[PDB]
């Protein structure tokens, strides 16, 4: 697979450590040369130990080795491709026909599938198969689920953008509250579901649902290790402020919402700011949620298209 070995040698030399400093107490100098030469598979238990010898982060070592996924992996490339087609809709047809049939092969592929549906909806491209499959697809995927993983929250997050809330609603509830963190990418997706839900809720004026989500996000702040997304904290708080405004009816709440939206512009987040403004406009006019013209996404950052 990836050359975890070359990386190990790289780090060891850079830090001026001798081979005897790593394998001493872990393995024979003979086999170690094989691991480092990338001719012998290395076990997680071993890499972990070398990681402590070197003093360099374990996950960083994996990243340096190529775990810098999202591209090195089959499904990873498909996800980055989604961003491409969003800018070149002419590439939909061919690619969709490829993904669509393998949408239930894995939770990863399903999320990719939902990403395409969003492109089709945004470019008014026809996708008859969708409306005639989702319900069954969802049934098939979650009917007998117990515990949920990051990819699940990702799926539900992207599902909220292509399916009426009333339908996704029941799939969300079982996934919360959250009790523990399982990586930053996991913390990212679980926060996205709440952010997207809270938006649709406040938009359609479902103030009871909105409160639920505002509380779920607040709950995450009590779970040390979750690591909250700064940008989301700002966006979610602005929705929290609009929520209050719609209830306790105090111009202050509204002004705060505007102030928050403005800060996005002051810090260079032009694209996300423009989208936010477009959103405040619709809420002020009591418009229900409808896929906008501004499509926001989140890979390694909060961006627009």
């Amino acid at each position: 697979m990836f050359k975890i070995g070359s990386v190990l040698k790289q780090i060891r030399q850079e830090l001026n450590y001798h081979q005897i400093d790593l394998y001493s107490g872990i393995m024979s100098k003979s086999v170690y040369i094989k691991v480092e030469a990338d001719s012998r598979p290395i076990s997680v238990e071993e890499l972990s130990k070398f990681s402590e010898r070197l003093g360099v982060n374990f996950f960083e070592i994996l990243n340096r080795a190529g775990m810098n996924t999202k591209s090195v992996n089959e499904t990873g490339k498909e996800k980055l491709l989604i961003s491409k087609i969003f800018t070149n809709p002419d590439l939909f047809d061919k690619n969709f026909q490829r993904i669509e049939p393998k949408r239930l092969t894995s939770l990863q592929y399903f999320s990719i599938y939902l990403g395409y549906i969003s492109i089709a909806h945004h470019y008014n491209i026809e996708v008859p198969t969708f409306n005639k499959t989702i319900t069954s697809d969802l049934k098939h995927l979650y009917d007998k689920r117990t515990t949920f993983f990051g990819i699940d929250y990702e799926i539900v997050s992207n599902l909220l953008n292509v399916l009426p809330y009333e339908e996704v609603s029941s799939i969300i509830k079982p996934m919360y509250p959250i009790v523990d963190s399982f990586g930053k990418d996991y913390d990212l997706t679980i926060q996205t579901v709440l952010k997207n839900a809270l938006t649709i809720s406040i938009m359609n004026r479902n103030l009871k649902e909105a409160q639920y989500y505002i509380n779920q996000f607040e709950h995450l702040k009590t779970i040390k290790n979750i690591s909250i997304n700064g940008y989301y904290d700002l966006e979610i708080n602005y929705l929290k402020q609009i929520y209050q405004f719609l209830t306790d009816k105090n111009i202050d709440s509204y002004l705060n919402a505007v102030n928050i939206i403005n800060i996005f512009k002051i810090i260079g987040k032009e694209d996300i700011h423009r989208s936010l403004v477009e959103e405040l406009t619709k809420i002020s006019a009591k418009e229900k949620f409808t896929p906008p013209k501004e499509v926001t996404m989140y890979y390694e950052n909060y961006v627009a298209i």
Binding site: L80, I82, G150, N158, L188, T192, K195, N196, E294, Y298
Partner: peptide, 7 residues
């Protein structure tokens, strides 16, 4: 906003 996530 309703954002699309991809990890």
């Amino acid at each position: 906003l309703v954002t699309l996530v991809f990890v």
